[PDB]
Amino acid sequence: LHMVRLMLLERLLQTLPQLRNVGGVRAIPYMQVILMLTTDLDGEDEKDKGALDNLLSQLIAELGMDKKDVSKKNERSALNEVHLVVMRLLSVFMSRTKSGSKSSICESSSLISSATAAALLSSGAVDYCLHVLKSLLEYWKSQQLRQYVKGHAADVFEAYTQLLTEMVLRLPYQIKKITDTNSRIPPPVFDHSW
Amino acid sequence: DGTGFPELMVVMATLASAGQGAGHLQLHNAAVDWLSRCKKYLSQKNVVEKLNAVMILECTCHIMSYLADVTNALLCTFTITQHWYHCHTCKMVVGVCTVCAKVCHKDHEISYSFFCDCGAKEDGSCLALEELQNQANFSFAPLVLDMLNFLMDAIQTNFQQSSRAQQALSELHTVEKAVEMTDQLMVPTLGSQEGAFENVRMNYSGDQGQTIRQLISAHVLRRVAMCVLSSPHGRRQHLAVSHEKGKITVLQLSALLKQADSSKRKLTLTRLASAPVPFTVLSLTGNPCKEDYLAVCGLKDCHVLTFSSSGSVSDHLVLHPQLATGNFIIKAVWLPGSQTELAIVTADFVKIYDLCVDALSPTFYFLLPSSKIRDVTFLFNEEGKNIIVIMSSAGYIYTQLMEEASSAQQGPFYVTNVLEINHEDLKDSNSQVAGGGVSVYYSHVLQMLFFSYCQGKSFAATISRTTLEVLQLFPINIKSSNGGSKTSPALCQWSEVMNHPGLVCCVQQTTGVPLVVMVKPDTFLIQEIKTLPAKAKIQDMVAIRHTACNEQQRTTMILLCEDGSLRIYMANVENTSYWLQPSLQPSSVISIMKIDFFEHNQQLTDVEFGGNDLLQVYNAQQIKHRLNSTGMYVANTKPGGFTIEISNNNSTMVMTGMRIQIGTQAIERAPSYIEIFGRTMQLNLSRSRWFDFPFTREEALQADKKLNLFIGASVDPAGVTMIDAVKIYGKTTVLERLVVSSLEALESCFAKNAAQELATLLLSLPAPASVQQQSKSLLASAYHSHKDQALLSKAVQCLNTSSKEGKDLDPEVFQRLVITARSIAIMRPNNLVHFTESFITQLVNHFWKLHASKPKNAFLAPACLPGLTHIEATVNALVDIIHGYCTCTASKIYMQMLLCPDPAVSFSCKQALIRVLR
Amino acid sequence: MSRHEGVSCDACLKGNFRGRRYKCLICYDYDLCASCYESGATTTRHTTDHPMQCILTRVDFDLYYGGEAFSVEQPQSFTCPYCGKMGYTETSLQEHVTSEHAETSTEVICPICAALPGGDPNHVTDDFAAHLTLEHR
């Protein structure tokens, strides 16, 4: 059963390019299904670990860290909503790395969080987050997951800019916390400008 | 001799019970012979033909039932050193931190600048740091089989006595209709005394009042005083009534509609907050899509009121029809299947507003070439576009498609397309068709156009929604029971009872006597609703289908009389249930498948502590003071304890919890228990201490501004009970009998391929939600293997046949197949995969085909319902089946379902996949 | 123990009873003990709908009104004789009666005179507001 769920997740990520302008709200169920499948991609099993790493690589290819379209990142877009969905999925993944009631699950959860943080840093995602943050700050100057589902029952992205800001306040913060917990992965370097 | 034969048969069965207790084949053999004899008679094909065009048939049914029965019998803050807590169990009142309370003192007595003492402890305590059966199975069972076989033609005929609904609708559209007068459609049940509603008679007077009187007398305007505000989606069954004072009263109908069987009880209509309108109210119109919206129209004014759940006006929108000189608002129409589209109809024009966009500028602005507007109805074509239909004073019916070309963006649009209707009664004279036009109404459920003329000529017609041509025309002739009234009265106020297809209401334009019409595929049953006495002239009528105490969707008609009395009529289910029969209804089995609390709260202020048992001894201020003062307390010598009433005077705050301090004065005088929200909490304290009580989300809503706290008696021998402090916290047929008997008998005898084939035929054969249940009971490792094989083999055969003939699988048939497959995907997914083996792909393909035919809007949907009754449930089931296969293309199907623009499809799919992971 | 001396219960006839004295503000010289009151005792002259004034003994006063210093047996909770509402002070009662019962001319017994020691317990007035303004303000 575990192996068949894993291959199902694999085929899902393989057709995943199709998910782009479909709409994050219509795809909430799809990414939530991905999560449910991952809730089993744990253990010290390295086949599952590599499946998780391939999922992370797909998410990075989706993420525009390389793209310098910071303006298009500020402008709410299908791509921006898909990036927000990817960030929420990563947060749900690293949010269950606690040791509470974990029968060797803490060992797996810790490994998962460490791998996620390492992959995100290897793509210079922290720099891209800093860029989108300066862009939203300029926007403010011009003006002058299922938890969201509970809070915002309407299930409408509503203030995407706020969600985007809040989501980066979370992803890199989790990155720093994980790079401190796992000494092997170095914490992001922040200069005076940061 | 059919009469008496069943009573004698029951005496025979009781004597069989005698011999059953002690005897040998007492009645078993004779009963077999009786079955044989009943088969012999029915075998008379002359009697079969007579039944097709009964005592012996009833005898056979009774014998079969008896035989069936016979066969049945056979970390801690200390880590860092805040919200601290006392643990009474550990005798720490010294305190524990929030974490330690939930970790080291988990399941202990706990009460909401400090350093956790739990962690301060270096002990390591802190973790947060018989013969009859032989004869029946010998040759009796085959006997029964051959009996049902040679009788099968007659059995199929008796069974005949979505597809059916479509056929019935087709017949409705093609077959000539007989007009019959009846008094049995609506039966009087309850009535109120004269004056139940004061001031309902609108005494029009003055310049504007005289104008209104003239218009009503000229039959140009009619007053609609009552409106029901109960959308199918909503559950707030309510009645809005306008009064002479121009005040709108909202009543609660739920109490009235439940007292339907009350023999001698006064009509009960709970009054809610009224509705303010600065004008004489002439018409009330509720939004069928949203039960909170009410359009209120005067002569020149149109107001849209929004009602809260309590019946009070939450919002008030004022429209500007910009009437022409001398023009007036005839009525307001909520476009079908819309919540913002509101049409204002005048004698000169029709303006349609989208209230979500703009209340000032109309989206559509229609004008006629000549004559005046007498009525306007809206239909939705197969495309789904609204097509306005306008009845003129000259008697012409104008039609126009509502598109960008006819939009008000370029100014007023002149409607020139006239619906051509040719009838002997319809002879236009002096440019007046049958004396001119009166009313027009389109029933989306029946897909028929109703319209009437001034000379009493009324018609029902079938119209092509693409070409807007009349296909078939049916005259509705009303014959006055009173002699001398040869002239037919004109009909107006045409309407259909929501969720009761075929039941149409209208009123004579001149007489004003309500008419109820039951439309069947070959007959119009018409009932004139009379008054006893006639002195109570009927002012307005409202019909509503409500859930009765027996959960029966009874159709109740409410009449408002001029004298202020209410009269209630109930639909006779026998004469009005044709379209509601399970044979025509889309019955679906898929339906069956379908401690830190106080940290985030703030102590309330100005809460009124006013327990009546304390009010007699202490004043309101004293109670508050004593409950909020140390060394001060409240006492009560009343045996059994007392009740404290707490009133929240802060409308912005909700009570979410309470704390009580007891035992400060004397432990023996502390209450033994308390009761709040029906929960009893025992107060086992040995020292003065606080007791924490949070209110559940539901209880928080219950304790919004009022809370009753019952205090139990203390163990004090003097009977004295004391409370030291209370703190409130908050936040901002014959056929039926026959089939039953036969199938029960067959199932008992079976307790197999031929038996399954017989049940399969019975399953395919038609049934009014009866033979099916019977075939269900007939059907109820080797066993599961056979059973699963037979059901799945049939499912595969049904899907293949439908794919080859290129025919969409019957929704109900499809849903049955899905449920059957699902059940197996859970019981034995291995059997599901093996027997079916393409199958998943076929199911999903048919799902999408049926989903694509699903009706866009329920109100617009006709009597026959295409698509699927429960897509969500269906989607859930499909996901279980797909998952069952994967445990033993499917991923692409899952992705397609998740992406479906239709939200529920993916959201339910979401839930199904969570369950499969769980 | 302090007892309601010279006060017999009109329902059970137990004179000089203890506990909370209940006096009818409608029936002339009608009194109930705590038990009879709680049981809803009725007579030909008295019904449960009649507003009643609770009167305490001194001992009870010290118990019920314990922890807060008050005048010896000082009644501070008054019942409206018209509608039966409770927990009123000589002031709030006056305000209530003037506001809600200004047009009522039914004869009633003054709860303040009845409860206050030395005040005429069986005092009868058609206009209760008159006492609330001239005798008990």
Ligand SMILES: [Zn+2]
């Ligand atoms: Zn602690």
Ligand SMILES: [Zn+2]
């Ligand atoms: Zn403890």
Ligand SMILES: [Zn+2]
């Ligand atoms: Zn602790």
Ligand SMILES: [Zn+2]
């Ligand atoms: Zn007594």
Ligand SMILES: [Zn+2]
């Ligand atoms: Zn009395």
Ligand SMILES: [Zn+2]
């Ligand atoms: Zn009063």
Ligand SMILES: [Zn+2]
């Ligand atoms: Zn007085």
